Amino acid sequence: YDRALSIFSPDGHIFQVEYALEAVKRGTCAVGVKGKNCVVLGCERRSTLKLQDTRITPSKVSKIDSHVVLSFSGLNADSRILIEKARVEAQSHRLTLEDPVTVEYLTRYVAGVQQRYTQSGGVRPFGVSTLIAGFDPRDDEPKLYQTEPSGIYSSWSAQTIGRNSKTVREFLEKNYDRKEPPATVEECVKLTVRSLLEVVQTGAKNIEITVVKPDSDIVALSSEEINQYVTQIEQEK
Amino acid sequence: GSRRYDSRTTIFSPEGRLYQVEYALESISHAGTAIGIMASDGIVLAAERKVTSTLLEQDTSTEKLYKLNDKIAVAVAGLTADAEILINTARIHAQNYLKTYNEDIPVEILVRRLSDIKQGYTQHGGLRPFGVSFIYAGYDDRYGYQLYTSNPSGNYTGWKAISVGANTSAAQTLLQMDYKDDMKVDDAIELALKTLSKTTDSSALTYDRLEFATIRKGANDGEVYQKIFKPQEIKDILVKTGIT
Amino acid sequence: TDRYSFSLTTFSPSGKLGQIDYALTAVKQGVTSLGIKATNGVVIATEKKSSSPLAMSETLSKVSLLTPDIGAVYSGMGPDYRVLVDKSRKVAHTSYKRIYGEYPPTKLLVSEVAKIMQEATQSGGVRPFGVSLLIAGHDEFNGFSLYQVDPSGSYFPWKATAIGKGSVAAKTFLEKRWNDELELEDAIHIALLTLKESVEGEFNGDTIELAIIGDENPDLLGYTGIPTDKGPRFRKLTSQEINDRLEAL
Amino acid sequence: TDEFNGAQLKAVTVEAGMIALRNGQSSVKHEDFVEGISEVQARKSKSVSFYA
Amino acid sequence: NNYDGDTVTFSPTGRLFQVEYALEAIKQGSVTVGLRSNTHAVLVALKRNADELSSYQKKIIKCDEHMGLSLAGLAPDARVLSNYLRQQCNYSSLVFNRKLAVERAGHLLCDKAQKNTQSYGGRPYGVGLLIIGYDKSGAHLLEFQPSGNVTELYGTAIGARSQGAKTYLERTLDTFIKIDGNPDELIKAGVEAISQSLRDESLTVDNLSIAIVGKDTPFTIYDGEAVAKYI
Amino acid sequence: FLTRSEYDRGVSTFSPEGRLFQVEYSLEAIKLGSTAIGIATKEGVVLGVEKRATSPLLESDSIEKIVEIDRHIGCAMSGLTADARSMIEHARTAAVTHNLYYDEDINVESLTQSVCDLALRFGEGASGEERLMSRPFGVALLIAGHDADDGYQLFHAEPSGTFYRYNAKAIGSGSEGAQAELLNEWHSSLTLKEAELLVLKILKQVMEEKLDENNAQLSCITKQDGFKIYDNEKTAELIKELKEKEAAE
Amino acid sequence: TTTLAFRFQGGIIVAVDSRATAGNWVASQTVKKVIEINPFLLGTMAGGAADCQFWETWLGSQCRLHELREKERISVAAASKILSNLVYQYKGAGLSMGTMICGYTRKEGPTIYYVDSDGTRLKGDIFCVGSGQTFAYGVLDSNYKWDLSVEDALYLGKRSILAAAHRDAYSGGSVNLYHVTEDGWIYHGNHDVGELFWKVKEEEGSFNNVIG
Amino acid sequence: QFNPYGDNGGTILGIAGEDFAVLAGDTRNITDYSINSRYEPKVFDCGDNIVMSANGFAADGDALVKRFKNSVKWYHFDHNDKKLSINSAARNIQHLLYGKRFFPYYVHTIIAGLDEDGKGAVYSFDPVGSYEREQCRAGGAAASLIMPFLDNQVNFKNQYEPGTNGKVKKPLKYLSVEEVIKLVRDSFTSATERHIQVGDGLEILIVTKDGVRKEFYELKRD
Amino acid sequence: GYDLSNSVFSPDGRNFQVEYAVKAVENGTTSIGIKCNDGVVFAVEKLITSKLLVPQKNVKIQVVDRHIGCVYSGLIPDGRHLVNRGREEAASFKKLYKTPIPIPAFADRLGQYVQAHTLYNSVRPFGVSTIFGGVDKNGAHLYMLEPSGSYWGYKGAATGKGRQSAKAELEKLVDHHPEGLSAREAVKQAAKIIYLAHEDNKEKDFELEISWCSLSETNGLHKFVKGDLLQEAIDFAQKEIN
């Protein structure tokens, strides 16, 4: 097989990149907001279905190195091929050039990965959009990037992708400030919970929060924790 | 010539969606039901055969149930030919893991590997999917008993109670009302049987139309006895629960 | 060039795979064959057919030998049967008489041939072989066994079955005619009697081909002076033996 | 004129006395029939070429 | 589309329309004229600028110090063919220690188009080349079509308004054959030859591109204030 | 959408046009390009790009369409910028290859010609080069540069595989509006700060926000200082001194 | 032949000879055993002249292609371990390789790496590779203090090579000094080793054994 | 059993000047003790005021003349008649040498020409790969005869002003195109009598900004 | 659809593609092959398109080996590929068996190549008819090869536009001479029926090329008839048609 699954369109596009963006629209919603000394990725999980084992099943936030997290929206099945490439590149960087990867280098790699499956024959793009966030090593600047299935990469101050992202994005213009992040880690978490409660709704059990602090500390806050943070927002509102 | 007659079935729809995956999911509710129910002391796997005839030999048949290794067995529902292949791919993967680390595979790892295999066929190469759904019952020490379903797209989620195949919606409603977090294996056997008695696609529900298998902690010294039952041991526990 | 590597079998919008739905119809447009499984043996019997009556029929085989304990018989297409019998044998030698240095069990042989059908269902440049095979054989540890491999690539063990165009009627006849112990002597009379309800044709040994996986024959051994091995458990029945049984129906 | 059909050639001859009228004459010059070649043919130019 | 959109097919007529389509590459092409006498070849190509801030894109490629080719048609196609001619030209210099035979190289070219017109997913090239050179048998002018026809002519054109040049060459045919030893005249005859093939596009001192090859003068491309001597 | 296209089933198929349709579509993706303006003088070349703000929450000072090939050649991308992620690496490789083999600064024209040879390699397998692409690139470059052999040169590289040397060219969406003004205001008697201010004049007209250094970026290639990306503090000064002289009217 | 480098306060002094022999015959006496890996890395040439020279040109090719892509200058530890993975390949395809890549960056400081022909890569503050590395060591380690000043340090690069030159058969030719700073290397020219002899003979009082 | 390296002898000699450069060589070809030919150029012009000579094993030495002049072609083509400089040319030769090192060339290669200042320029290659600029450099089998005499006369190595006895160093005198003709002749006179693989003929090629001139002198017949 | 390609079949025994290839050959110029006692004599009508051409400087008879003449009509470029292929195949046989290829052997080879181009989706059957022969040591033979991959022995064959005029006149020549005629005498016969085959093609002007391979004139090599011998043929024919 060497026949195209990418047929050029007279519109100034490729159909399959437009189809791949819709597929991303229909995916679960991710928020990213970076503090002054943290990153915070909040993601919706549909836990609406009952008798779900949640212990054994991976969160929709995957660590790809000891200080770079990747969250995603769109085709869940497809995403895992990207996560396996990216973990592999992370070691290769240590092998041949030494030190851990930079968030930028890894983001670029991801960018070239999704890009490839557009331009090559025999393959269709991936309809998966990533939020790549993290720290560079020896550094303490949070750097929050977004890559999208067009194979276009971006830096962002805060971003959201997924379902009904627009509703959260308008909220984020108005409650997060370009000039000032919220400075405590805790307030940043609650700003993102407060944002999540627009579309997600339906109790606080469909909210999951991963917080990363520099020096390679990725911890994910449990349901119990969230429960306390949500109730606060609830009372104050 | 060839490009003219090319199907192109691995392109996205306007919805971003993959028609052949859905078509695969449509056709597995035309195959029999396979259910997993996780007890706290073991896992019951209960499958209803999609064939039956009095001239059938359905006694050497293990046509839904397969051992991948002595600790992780599967329930298969769908097109059996495609499924057979993955079953020996899986054996090859288990033994590989065992060659290199000299330690049995955890359930987490083998379910991720099969799923990536599926992912490849829908992702490119112009092929049609492998239309199979597996219910993995397995034991590992690291996370205990773990129960799993995977679908032809190649995506997995863990479950405490699941149903696949015919009447998925139906079996799910029932399971939610008659589940309790911790059960004995017997109570589970009972429940496994009971759900299939209300969902059976023929009125009658019989032992020779049940394949039924467990993994039990009734092996002493913290080991797990994989048991695929003989249909004459199925016959007694079906009279026990009072169905027949 | 070539660019046929895309699947030519695809899911249908209504579900089920169109190409295997087409192939199965074809099996019921063919000749008729049946197999009865006895306690102490297995029988398969089928009709021999040719274009013209002036054609031979001894130079044609629809009961074919895989191993000295395992024969196959088909219903479906002649050309498509011929190639798969050869491939059945080739894989039986390369993956089991080289690695265990003996012949495979019936269940194990079934499964191998089911993979070959399977890649005729998957991938480009193939369409399914349009046959249904019976694989009756004997191995020592599970005794007598009868299988059916279908166009789709699954297998089924049966206790008695038929395939071909006269199939729906034939399994109904054999439902009342099956018994819990049937002897091989008795079974031979049964299969003939069923295929007589299914065949109009002039009924001799020369048109009805009979093969048994009965019991071992130390005379088809080809050597003597080894008591350790025993001969073929398969034994193809030529015209003379069937002629006595014609008269005993 | 190369490969001009008789209807196009009728259409140069007419088109010359349009040009004549616009300059404002009463006699039709030999330099007008040449400019009716360009103004009326059958095709508007050799299109846009970006590498042809 | 009945039989029109596929280079492998036929065609109840017995043509195919894909070849005819490629012959429109010539038609939308810019005029170029080649004429040879017997001591000198000359290609006169009418370059084309995109706009005023822009330069002109050359239309004559030095293939060798005795061979040159000029395109008419698509610019990417031309760049594929020019590389190839050069590789087979250096092969003959290396292996047989020999200037490349002009007549032979026309058949190498032919078979390269032919194999993209045999197999599906190929294309017919949309460039027709005029290849002049001077070897051991004297001056030569090869005419290459998309079909893959190679013809040797005394003087020819391809391009838009090729007809108007070709009727000029029928007059002045008997003139140019008989001027020999005076390369200057044959150039003047080529300036005039392409004047006839203008759409009032004029000839400037960076639009007109002359290249010659002689008995004693290697392949050279003139442009600049070199051309103005002929203009 | 759904505009008549007779042929377009092959990725190279003809077409009563006399030229391929797919190449034409590639050029119609540069009219959706974020506008890149470039004024080439004999004292230097200025590459200006509108960074393009999409959101107030997007950091628009981190994203830029100035891309360095090497110190003596700069380049600007407009169109579908994912396609330029692959080519710009290739071009940087190329330059370096030349410095390895010849230890010399590569000609601007030569370098331009190399990504064109890359640009033409769409296909299902044909010609001397093995096709590895299957759809044409939908991106155009403005390779600027400085060599000490032919001076300042500025090229417009096409997805077609064609290169036209310009003396100033703007591409992008506001291309049509830009090139009316270039035609009158350009000349060869310019000086570097009168050109620089010309980039910001024309940037002002194709601006979809307003002009400030939080959505516009200037960059130069100078003979004795090389390729230099102008920072935002410096960029600001010039934008204000335009605004001083436009208020002298 | 001798190539030595020692880190000090100011950066690194590299000091190398310029005689490259073939047989007992002396080929050239004007060879530069400094290879500009870029302006901010200096590579030594020791072991086979062909092998060592070439691959460090191409290491400079990858240096510029680390540099564009990261928009950040190649680190000393990244270059070294590139070059190291390459020579492990041809480890017993019969090639040689003894370089010290010597560099100073703003976020890692001065760092020498000694990359071998077996793919051994050893960090360290002093290395000496060559057929006169035994003669070089002794004098270099006696006259060492880590805290040193630039003038003094420059003098040490000469004095150790000199000693090496005097007894070693293939050492001599000319010496060259470079002083690596963070900003780059600055080149300090060419001193003939035999005219250097008579100067330090006077100044120190050395080389009593040489008659006259 | 096969061994594909012999010797074919010959001797080459490169001298850089102040607006000239001289690359000479002999025209004797031998294999062992039999004279193949008295006349056989080894010093070929290759265009753009580069003269090359690859001396040692003849076949090898013709192999890299082949590929070098092939590169002259492809450079001018895909750079549209760009003049290839001494600096540029050097580095190309080195790539061809090195890439075969598991079947290497077994020659001593030298180029010479002018540089961009309008002074002589001479680079010399070792067998496997790498190279270094020189100002005098012989190569070949009579290399070690011509070389110490020419450093004694170009660079005046270990000579002093007279009557000072090692106090003052003799200053380096300028080099005329006429004077460097003489050195080559005198040297190759000494080469002949004391070394048995230089003879018949001497061919000096003098290269300037003005052009390439050939000049032929006889040597001894043996 | 089933009327479009080569791998298709249709229930009329037609395979419409291949039949369409004859229609290509039918646009060609007349080419004849006169089988004589001593060898074979080809001639081709070569259209003079314009007075701008350089004359007698295009050969439509190309040699394969040194003893098998080859002349083809249909698509001129397409034919040049088929001849190149039969020059490879001749050269492979010359090496492997160290003799010049027999003509029934040359027949097998070419025959196979065009047959090949009707069994794949991704190829087109070539639309050319060849006429090839010479002298080998089993004697002179002649073959005409259809685009369908059909061929037969032939005492005279033709193809082209003016295959209508040519065929009737070849009947005339086997009834003139049913005991055959000489290869020398046959030069004048090839001129005569090529000239008559330009009364289906009289919108242009043409040049006659004649070549022969006969044992008794050329020592069994494929040579061209040239100089004064060639103009005697031109005159002969020219006076009959006037």
- Residue C16 sits in a domain of what CATH number? 3.60.20.10
CA atoms within 13 A on the CB side of B202: 12
Helix (H, G, I), strand (E, B) or coil at G203: helix
Identify the CA nearest to E203 among candidates E168, E161, E231.
E231
Name chain I contacts of B6, Cβ cutoff 8 Å: none
Amino acid at E136: K
Question: Which burial class, exposed, middle or buried, applies to B83 when counting CB atoms under 10 A from its CB (0-12, 13-18, 19+)?
Answer: buried
Q: Confirm if A189 and A209 have CB atoms less than 8 A apart.
A: yes
Is any Cβ of chain C less than 8 angstroms from the Cβ of F16?
A: no
| Contact (CB<8Å) F70/G68 | yes
Radius of gyration, alpha carbons of chain F? 19
Residue E43 bridge partners (DSSP): E34, E211
| Contact (CB<8Å) G50/H102 | no
Helix (H, G, I), strand (E, B) or coil at H162: coil
Query: What backbone torsions phi and psi does residue F181 show, to the nearest 5 degrees?
Result: -75, -35
Name chain C contacts of E120, Cβ cutoff 8 Å: 1
Cβ contact A–G (≥3 pairs, < 8 Å): yes
Question: Which burial class, exposed, middle or buried, applies to E82 when counting CB atoms under 10 A from its CB (0-12, 13-18, 19+)?
Answer: buried
Task: Report the gap between the CA of F11 and the closest CA in chain B (Å).
Answer: 11
| Contact (CB<8Å) B116/A22 | no
Q: Cα separations (Å) of F231 from F50, F134, G145?
A: 14, 39, 44
Nearest CA in chain F to A122: F134
Name chain E contacts of B3, Cβ cutoff 8 Å: 120-121
Distance, first Cα to last Cα, chain E: 48
Q: Confirm if G151 and G143 have CB atoms less than 8 A apart.
A: no
Residues G123 and C96: their CA atoms lie apart, in Å, by: 57
DSSP, res I51: T
Identify the CA nearest to H11 among candidates H29, H32, H31.
H29
Nearest to A96 among G70, G81, G107 (CB): G81
Query: What backbone torsions phi and psi does residue E15 show, to the nearest 5 degrees?
Result: -90, -160
> How many C-beta neighbours within 10 Å does residue C222 have?
8
Give me the torsion for CA of I4, I9, I11, I12, rounded to 10°: 70
Q: Which residues touch F155 (CB under 8 Å, ≥6 apart)? A: F108, F109, F112, F141, F142, F143, F144, F145, F163, F164, F165, F166
* Core vs surface per residue A113-149: b (16+ CB within 10 A) or e: bbbbbbbbbbbbbbbbbbbbbbbbbeeeebbbbbbbb
* Residue with tokens 């009447």, as numbered in its chain: B167
Name chain C contacts of F125, Cβ cutoff 8 Å: 1
G15 is in an annotated binding site: no
Q: How many CB pairs under 8 A join A and G?
A: 22
Nearest CA in chain I to E11: I20
| Contact (CB<8Å) B13/A19 | yes
State yes or no: cis peptide before F15, omega within 30 of 0. Answer: yes
* Residue with tokens 């003094």, as numbered in its chain: G152
Identify the CA nearest to F49 among candidates F197, F200, F177.
F200
| Contact (CB<8Å) F93/G65 | yes
Name chain E contacts of C1, Cβ cutoff 8 Å: 119-121
**What tokens appear for A178 in the block?**
């370009």
Task: Report the gap between the CA of F111 and the closest CA in chain C (Å).
Answer: 35
Distance, first Cα to last Cα, chain A: 58
Residue A23 bridge partners (DSSP): none
Residues B206 and H40: their CA atoms lie apart, in Å, by: 102
Helix (H, G, I), strand (E, B) or coil at I140: strand
Nearest CA in chain C to E122: C1
Report the residue numbers after which chain D has a gap, meaning the C atom sits over 2.5 angstroms from the next written residue's N, or none.
none
Residues I193 and I163: their CA atoms lie apart, in Å, by: 10
Radius of gyration, alpha carbons of chain C? 19
Q: Confirm if E21 and F18 have CB atoms less than 8 A apart.
A: yes
Cβ contact E–F (≥3 pairs, < 8 Å): yes
Nearest CA in chain F to E49: F164
Chain I touching partners, 3 or more CB pairs below 8 A: B, C, E
Domain that holds residue H141: 1-222
Residues A25 and G16: their CA atoms lie apart, in Å, by: 64
Residue E141 bridge partners (DSSP): E132
Which stretches of chain F are assigned E, i.e. beta strand? 36-40, 45-49, 66-68, 73-79, 139-147, 151-157, 163-166, 168-171, 217-222, 226-229
Q: Cα separations (Å) of D8 from D18, D38, E172?
A: 15, 11, 29
The third-level CATH classification (topology) of the domain covering I6-242 is Glutamine Phosphoribosylpyrophosphate, subunit 1, domain 1 (3.60.20)
Cβ contact G–E (≥3 pairs, < 8 Å): no
Residues I30 and I202: their CA atoms lie apart, in Å, by: 12
Nearest CA in chain C to E121: C1
Resolution in angstroms comes to: 4.5
* Cα dihedral sign, G194-G199-G204-G206: positive
Nearest to G58 among F69, F89, F100 (CB): F100
Q: Which of C5, C7, C34, C110 should one mutate to test binding to chain B, selecting the residue with the greatest count of B CBs within 10 A?
A: C7
* For helices A223-236 and A185-196, angle between their N-to-C axes, nearest 10 degrees: 80
| Solved using | cryo-EM
Q: Confirm if A169 and A146 have CB atoms less than 8 A apart.
A: no
Domains along chain G with CATH numbers: 1-212 (3.60.20.10)
Domain that holds residue B52: 1-244
By residue count, chain C amounts to 249
* For helices A76-96 and B107-123, angle between their N-to-C axes, nearest 10 degrees: 110
- Helices (DSSP H) in chain G: which residue ranges? 49-70, 76-89, 133-142, 150-167, 193-204
Identify the CA nearest to E211 among candidates E34, E30, E31.
E34
Nearest to A178 among F25, F57, F138 (CB): F57
User: Which residues of G are part of the catalytic machinery?
Assistant: 1
Residues I97 and E115: their CA atoms lie apart, in Å, by: 30
3-state helix, strand, coil in chain F (%, to 5): 30, 20, 45
* Core vs surface per residue F209-242: b (16+ CB within 10 A) or e: eebebebbbbbbbeeeeebebbeeeebeebbeeb
Residues I158 and F10: their CA atoms lie apart, in Å, by: 39
DSSP, res E137: T
Query: What backbone torsions phi and psi does residue E210 show, to the nearest 5 degrees?
Result: -110, 150
Nearest CA in chain H to G22: H126
Domain that holds residue C108: 1-249
Is any Cβ of chain A less than 8 angstroms from the Cβ of B17?
A: yes
Q: How many helices (H) and strands (E) does chain D have?
A: 2, 0
Say which CATH number the domain at B210 has: 3.60.20.10
Identify the CA nearest to C144 among candidates C40, C22, C14.
C40
Identify the CA nearest to H127 among candidates H99, H98, H147.
H98
Is any Cβ of chain C less than 8 angstroms from the Cβ of F128?
A: no
Name chain D contacts of F162, Cβ cutoff 8 Å: 50-51
Say which CATH number the domain at H5 has: 3.60.20.10
Please report which helix (H) or strand (E) contains residue C87, including its range. helix C78-94
The total number of structural domains that make up chain C: 1
| Contact (CB<8Å) F162/D52 | no
Residue G38 bridge partners (DSSP): G41
Radius of gyration, alpha carbons of chain E? 18
Report long-range pairs for E12-17 (Cβ below 8 Å, ≥24 apart). E12/I20, E12/I23, E13/I23, E14/I20, E14/I21, E14/I22, E14/I23, E14/I24, E14/I26, E14/I27, E14/I127, E15/I24
User: Which residues of I are part of the catalytic machinery?
Assistant: 29
| Contact (CB<8Å) E75/F124 | no
Residues B155 and B112: their CA atoms lie apart, in Å, by: 8
Report long-range pairs for C220-223 (Cβ below 8 Å, ≥24 apart). none
**What tokens appear for A211 in the block?**
């917080």
Name chain C contacts of B79, Cβ cutoff 8 Å: 17, 152-154
Q: Which of D4, D31, D46 should one mutate to test binding to chain E, selecting the residue with the greatest count of E CBs within 10 A?
A: D46
Helix (H, G, I), strand (E, B) or coil at B66: strand
> How many C-beta neighbours within 10 Å does residue I84 have?
16
Q: Confirm if B33 and B165 have CB atoms less than 8 A apart.
A: yes
Residues G17 and G194: their CA atoms lie apart, in Å, by: 12
Nearest to E74 among D38, D47, D52 (CB): D52
Residue I41 bridge partners (DSSP): I34, I212
| Contact (CB<8Å) H130/G54 | yes
Nearest to A78 among B123, B143, B160 (CB): B123
Residues C114 and B88: their CA atoms lie apart, in Å, by: 13
Report long-range pairs for A137-144 (Cβ below 8 Å, ≥24 apart). A137/A67, A137/A99, A137/A100, A137/A102, A137/A216, A138/G107, A139/A214, A140/A37, A140/A214, A142/A34, A142/A35, A142/A36, A142/A37, A142/A38, A142/A39, A143/A34, A143/A103, A143/A104, A144/A32, A144/A33, A144/A34, A144/A39
Is any Cβ of chain F less than 8 angstroms from the Cβ of A123?
A: no
Q: Confirm if A2 and C3 have CB atoms less than 8 A apart.
A: yes
Helix (H, G, I), strand (E, B) or coil at I172: helix
